[PDB]
Write a protein that binds this ligand. Sequence first.
Ligand SMILES: [Mg+2]
Ligand SMILES: [Mg+2]
Ligand SMILES: [Mg+2]
Ligand SMILES: [Mg+2]
Ligand SMILES: [Mg+2]
Ligand SMILES: [Zn+2]
Lengths: 238, 92, 94
Amino acid sequence: MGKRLISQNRGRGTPTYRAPSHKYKADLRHPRVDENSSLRGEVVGIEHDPARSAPIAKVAFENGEELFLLASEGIAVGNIIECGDDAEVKPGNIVPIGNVPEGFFICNVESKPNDGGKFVRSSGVYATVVTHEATRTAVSMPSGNIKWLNPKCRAVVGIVAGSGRVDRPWLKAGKKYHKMKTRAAKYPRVSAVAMNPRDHPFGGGAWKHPGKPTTVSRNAPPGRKVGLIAARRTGMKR
Amino acid sequence: VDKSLIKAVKTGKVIVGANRTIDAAANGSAKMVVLASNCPEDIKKKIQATDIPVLEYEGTSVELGPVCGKPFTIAAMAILDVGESDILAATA
Amino acid sequence: MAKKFTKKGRISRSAGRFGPRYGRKDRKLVADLEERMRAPHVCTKCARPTVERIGTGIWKCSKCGHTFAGGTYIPYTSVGQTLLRTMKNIAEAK
RNA sequence: GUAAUUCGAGUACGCCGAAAGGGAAACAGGUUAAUAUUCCUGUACCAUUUAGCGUUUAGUCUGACGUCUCAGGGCAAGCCG
RNA sequence: AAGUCGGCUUCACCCCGGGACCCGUGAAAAGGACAGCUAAAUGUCCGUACCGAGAACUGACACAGGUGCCCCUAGCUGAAA
RNA sequence: GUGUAGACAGCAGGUCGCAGUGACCAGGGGGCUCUAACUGUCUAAUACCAACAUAGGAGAUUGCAAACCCGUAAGGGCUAG
RNA sequence: GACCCUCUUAAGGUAGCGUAGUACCUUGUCGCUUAAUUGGCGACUUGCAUGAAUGGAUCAAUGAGAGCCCUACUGU
Ligand SMILES: [Mg+2]
Ligand SMILES: [Mg+2]
Ligand SMILES: [Mg+2]
Ligand SMILES: [Mg+2]
Ligand SMILES: [Mg+2]
Ligand SMILES: [Zn+2]
């Protein structure tokens, strides 16, 4: 048995591949609201979240419990939020996507109703509402695809803050090193062709070349799906 | 509304600043009080409590300043006596 | 006005702290981004230039006290500007 | 759950984990062959309980925080007449 | 046995405040403060000698290695340990 | 001469030796090529390199009850994403 | 040594570099460097068996990397 790969080591969950959970501030989710309820609340502070490298907002609600929230751009300390079914459309509120007009930008969209939000969450991303049929609504995801969501889904209006995070090049191994200390990723990563034939399917030889084609089928067993997994095309555009 | 302020600053009694305007309004000698649009809400409480007419100004205090003749910013200004001006006619 | 911009000391700007490293392209990009970041930005309530960067995407007004979330390197982004323009025109048409 | 356990991840309830993290309170001198803020002389200080004499504001503050760089004040050590 | 006075400097120690940097944001809980004052009584348990290293540890050794250079150190020359 | 000061900087004349940073301490320099951009890592005990890493460039999978992976299962890693 | 043809069992090397850390023949031929050089550098090159992210060419700063030359110095 030539040694397992890095992906299977991540599978086991050894301490080298586990996220340092105790650093993260808090989990981000929408307020839990019963049927036919509408709770409000005004921002108390704007705070930095080390799990995403973007700001988050602290909001104190009328019942008493405060929650961190995914901060859309423009959110300022003092503004009140009106999450609920009867909310109007403004930058900051949380409203169903069924009664959001076409052309408006949204973020922190849910998959099924009352999930808290799963799509459109990294820095500066956003999605759009395209069409409103009776049973579904099509939103263009930041990847570039059309998704058909339930009309009774919740999403904050605006775009996620922190836009432009990747216009600043690293230009050092040290800065990227410092980012990786608060993530589960491993840094730095050895290249496969420089290993031994025990360690990887590509290792070995008197000179460093893959030897076999890099594209691998989708049916390859675990421990072999390394390279271009089931690629449809390769190369740049000529 | 705009050219009257030129004569209000040229002639008559005027005071620039929030606190002196508060004093003039409470004393009542300030016939009218002029405020900028984006002023803090903490000032509107006195301008409603004071019986003095409340002349709005559509602009912001940042450009209100230079037109009044002062490079700095003017939040609330009162004209005690108009003299050779008719800004009061704009207000009352 | 500022530090000596001699016959030479004029191209690097803030990227002159890297010395002869990292190449021309990356240094130019970082320098230009830094002159955009160090700009005298303007407030939204005060309408006075007082906004500076507190953290990653956090901005504050020195005189006004107003705190808000914006871009990572610049306070206001073009997409947010477009959203404001469109929503405000829709509201004002009503 | 496992054929089954002394085996196995998670959840609930507990409980442990720092003689360099947090932390209520003591100093001088003497004494012995070998112990000393521990024994002796002097002068102090802090908690829990009991009894007497009164009272909350009870929700906040503190404990409680990175790297570099600099001004101001003070002081053990040091030096001069 | 004298046991009186002045002056300079002051880190590597204490207090206090400012600035810059981050695609790094730099612990938690017990405890304490805000209502206490007076009096007597109680304050159990464990460690405490000596070495801490070119002879008291570890490498079979009274071993030129390592753990510990972990934390501290006077006068002159000299930027200076 | 500067400075509140500690101190620091500068001058004029005389004079000794073979030699004045007089001992201690304390870079030899230049030119033409190959190679890796650089700072970093490495066969503990024969290999400190042109090898590994790196910022930069490009490609591929996946809209989350996802892609990739661990377990016989119960359940998990990535993921407070 | 062109270019019409080929052998074209898919196509038959574009820019570049070239006796190379790759050139067997080989101490390849010529120039600068020495009294004298299987060396170093430059030029040519019919490339046994160079060539474009199996990355090509060149490159300031850096190097306990690998060669050759000058000056000072010395019991090498
Ligand atoms: Mg194999
Ligand atoms: Mg304990
Ligand atoms: Mg190197
Ligand atoms: Mg390599
Ligand atoms: Mg020779
Ligand atoms: Zn402001």
